Amino acid sequence: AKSKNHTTHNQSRKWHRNGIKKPRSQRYESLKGVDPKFLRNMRFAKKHNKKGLKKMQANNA
């Protein structure tokens, strides 16, 4: 006939068995979702980044 409707009993110890693991961040996260006008400048700031190795290497040395 009727039955139990809802409970979160036992749930807090279910998901502590394999731990509640934090999201493992890494260096160099993804650029998915940044401003599109911002992002095509940065692709242009790296497309022309070789334009000036010779001035840069004759300035570290």
Query: Which chain residues interact with Mg ion by CB under 5 A?
Result: 3
Check: CB of residue 27 under 8 Å from CB of residue 19: no
Contacts to other proteins from residues 1-60, by CB under 8 A: 11, 14-15, 20-23, 25, 29, 33-35
**Is 12 among the residues that bind RNA (CB under 7 A)?**
yes
CB 39 within 8 A of CB 31: yes
Amino acid identity at 37? K
What DSSP state is assigned to residue 1? -
- Binding-site ranges for RNA (CB under 7 A): 1-22, 24-27, 32-33, 35-38, 40-42, 44-49, 51-52, 55-56, 59-60
